[PDB]
Design an enzyme around this catalytic site. Sequence first.
Site, PDB file in Angstrom:
ATOM      1  N   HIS D  40      11.627  55.917  58.617  1.00 58.23           N
ATOM      2  CA  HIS D  40      10.710  55.986  59.805  1.00 58.23           C
ATOM      3  C   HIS D  40      10.000  54.946  59.901  1.00 58.23           C
ATOM      4  CE1 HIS D  40       7.692  57.527  56.660  1.00 58.23           C
ATOM      5  NE2 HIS D  40       6.840  56.932  57.476  1.00 58.23           N
ATOM      6  N   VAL D  57      -5.807  38.033  54.112  1.00 60.17           N
ATOM      7  CA  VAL D  57      -6.153  36.827  53.618  1.00 60.17           C
ATOM      8  C   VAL D  57      -5.154  35.949  52.877  1.00 60.17           C
ATOM      9  CG1 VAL D  57      -7.862  35.172  52.481  1.00 60.17           C
ATOM     10  CG2 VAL D  57      -8.532  37.312  53.506  1.00 60.17           C
ATOM     11  N   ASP D  84      14.600  60.217  54.391  1.00 58.48           N
ATOM     12  CA  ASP D  84      13.794  59.076  54.816  1.00 58.48           C
ATOM     13  C   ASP D  84      13.834  57.908  53.911  1.00 58.48           C
ATOM     14  OD1 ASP D  84      11.781  57.769  56.075  1.00 58.48           O
ATOM     15  OD2 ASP D  84      10.133  58.956  55.415  1.00 58.48           O
ATOM     16  N   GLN D 174      -1.763  57.632  55.505  1.00 56.66           N
ATOM     17  CA  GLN D 174      -1.040  56.786  56.635  1.00 56.66           C
ATOM     18  C   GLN D 174      -1.384  55.222  56.195  1.00 56.66           C
ATOM     19  OE1 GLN D 174      -0.735  60.477  58.291  1.00 56.66           O
ATOM     20  NE2 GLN D 174      -3.066  59.637  57.919  1.00 56.66           N
ATOM     21  N   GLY D 175      -0.059  54.551  56.409  1.00 55.38           N
ATOM     22  CA  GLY D 175      -0.248  53.019  56.089  1.00 55.38           C
ATOM     23  C   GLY D 175       0.455  52.836  54.662  1.00 55.38           C
ATOM     24  N   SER D 177       3.471  54.547  53.950  1.00 52.74           N
ATOM     25  CA  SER D 177       4.942  54.858  54.150  1.00 52.74           C
ATOM     26  C   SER D 177       5.832  53.605  53.817  1.00 52.74           C
ATOM     27  CB  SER D 177       5.152  54.950  55.679  1.00 52.74           C
ATOM     28  OG  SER D 177       4.721  56.319  56.160  1.00 52.74           O
ATOM     29  N   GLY D 178       7.084  54.256  53.308  1.00 51.85           N
ATOM     30  CA  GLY D 178       7.965  53.303  52.905  1.00 51.85           C
ATOM     31  C   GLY D 178       7.529  52.791  51.203  1.00 51.85           C
TER      32      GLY D 178
END
Lengths: 175, 175, 223, 223
Positions: D40, D57, D84, D174-175, D177-178
């Site tokens: 996804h 940074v 997935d 969230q964030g 993922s993978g």
Amino acid sequence: DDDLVDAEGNLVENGGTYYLLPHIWAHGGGIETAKTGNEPCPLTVVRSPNEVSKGEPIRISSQFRSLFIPRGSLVALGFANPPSCAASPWWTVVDSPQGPAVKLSQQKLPEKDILVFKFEKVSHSNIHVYKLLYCQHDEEDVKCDQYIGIHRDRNGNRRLVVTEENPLELVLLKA
Amino acid sequence: DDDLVDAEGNLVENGGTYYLLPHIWAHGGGIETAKTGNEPCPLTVVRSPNEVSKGEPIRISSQFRSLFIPRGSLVALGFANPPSCAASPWWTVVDSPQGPAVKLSQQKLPEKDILVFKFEKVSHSNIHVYKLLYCQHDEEDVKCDQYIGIHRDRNGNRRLVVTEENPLELVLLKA
Amino acid sequence: IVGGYTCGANTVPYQVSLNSGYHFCGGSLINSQWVVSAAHCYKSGIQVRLGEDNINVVEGNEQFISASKSIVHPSYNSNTLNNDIMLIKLKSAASLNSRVASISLPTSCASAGTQCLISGWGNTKSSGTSYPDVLKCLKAPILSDSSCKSAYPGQITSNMFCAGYLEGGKDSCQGDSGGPVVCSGKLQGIVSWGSGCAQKNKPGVYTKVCNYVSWIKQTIASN
Amino acid sequence: IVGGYTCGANTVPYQVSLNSGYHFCGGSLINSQWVVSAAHCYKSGIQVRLGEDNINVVEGNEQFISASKSIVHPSYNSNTLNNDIMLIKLKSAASLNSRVASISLPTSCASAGTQCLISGWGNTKSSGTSYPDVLKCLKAPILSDSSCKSAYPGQITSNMFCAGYLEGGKDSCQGDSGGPVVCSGKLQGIVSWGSGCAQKNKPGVYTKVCNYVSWIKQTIASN
Ligand SMILES: [Ca+2]
Ligand SMILES: [Ca+2]
């Protein structure tokens, strides 16, 4: 005195999280949930069977906009970390085969069905123990002349219910 | 760079709030609620009658732990500020006299009942528009081969329902 | 107070703070010897802090006077939150000035739609916790009695009145209790109670001071 | 990551950040030219940023290498969040050092109770949003397959597995993922989905990598 305080003698933080534990002269642990009836998740408020468990942390609220719970104020009682299947985390007294029972609901509850509790100091000192009252609306004025007690059911759960006798006693510990 | 994008062309924030506007405003305004039938409160998901209103801000969420809704993901859709009487702010598709309709419930509904939506991009050369698919579990797969649409009832309300015609055209505006 | 702004030091000269170690309730200076706050704000070791802004720092214009007496309305009912009003007599008279000034009692009740100023050092964001160092303010209009009773089913008495916004986002909160609600330079309400803070269809409920003007003028003339 | 801690610059050498003008997903390095993330998370023109910590940074250890081919799983189903898994081949071989290293493919399918390290730059609040500059870390155990299915009725397939705490408060978000799930030196899972974050009886679901060891090698050989 009729002032509400925790184990350490501190007033109760309005909205503050607490453990509702027993004092040493009692069996069981803190307040928990149980899955009775057709409930899809634990929606029954009971007293833990494990003398070692603190139970679930309980959110105690008063409508008064003070930092503490005022004396003789009614309070809303709810699980800070409720189960997913309960519309809200507020406890409510509902009718049932075991008498008026303290449960969580899969439906939003009108404020009048949750603003039904009141603590009560237990005369003698050494421990800051309180009993729990269930209050009702005589339309204008609210009356709290009925306690919440423990009624062990078939499956062993010590359910919190409005009992004629065998009053539930609590010592509040900050969570 | 995936399929789901708002009016300004940006990816939709997972769990973010958006106004669900129509492509052709002669169809109505943004989405909101109304009390239909015997409902005790606004539990029917309708397109606003007001040709100028943005409707209610709507939460769009995917279980995928991504920052933005992945292309082709299922979604739950809910009002950022639902009517007090609803258990959860999420939409669900209940069976009705005139067919499967989008409504709110007074009972907390398990996830299977709210993870039933999916967006489908409309091929308009310029302006981002999507149709809305309804999905229901089958052979260990969830199928989305039915659209959502508007059924004008007697009392006027522009009901969102699972119809085969009058499909919804949607334009998402970040709130 | 949620959705408010920083008032500005000593801008609300009648605003007092009740201390018992820390701040627990607001209060309103009605004359150099008496303060009016809520009944549920009663304690027996109240120290009144006047001429305050940053309740956590001594900015130099404060006045600390203990309470010799604390009189809760004889008809206050904690169970119904009714008659939530209390009178506090300062041990010594407060020095009146620009940083510490009393607020006038009403002669007639206020009319719905009238814009008032609610202030206090209560929680600024309810849906979490954050308590201001400095005093916060909020302009809130009285709301119609029907929408008030509709907001809080079977709870509104004639000694209560709502104010704020039915959309939410701007309301008073835990910590503002006992504080002032002034309209047209008159003390119309006392921060009392409400369901949550700044919630939709959950406006602040305030003690209707105007109904107690005779009781106040009667109490101050006997004690 | 919610309820986690600051890992430490380059303490998670295999953690990569899939970038699209900004960070959008995590990934894992399995060799100088291949990164394994989630399906996804598939995009066009992905830029893989290696050796990161503060993604906003530049500190001197980064390595940006654009994706030359992004192979999503052939049986991947977005409607069921099934299979997935994605494979990303870099156009330029990463330079392997102490801050940029590959994590080895699993050789077994870790049982319940196994301890792992979940990391990423995802959100750190269950309720609300707060995205970190530095990589966050979370030590969590794999939960029983049965605890998994009970928490997510009719959603768990043999290609997934729960890890975390049924009581909540600690989880991926969230964030993330993978992102990687390394249990004792081996890549056991990829941060995939879940309901909300760190919620009660709603653990994180992770792609069970052990079921793709064959796919990953058919891929890497023929590409
Ligand atoms: Ca000061
Ligand atoms: Ca960097």
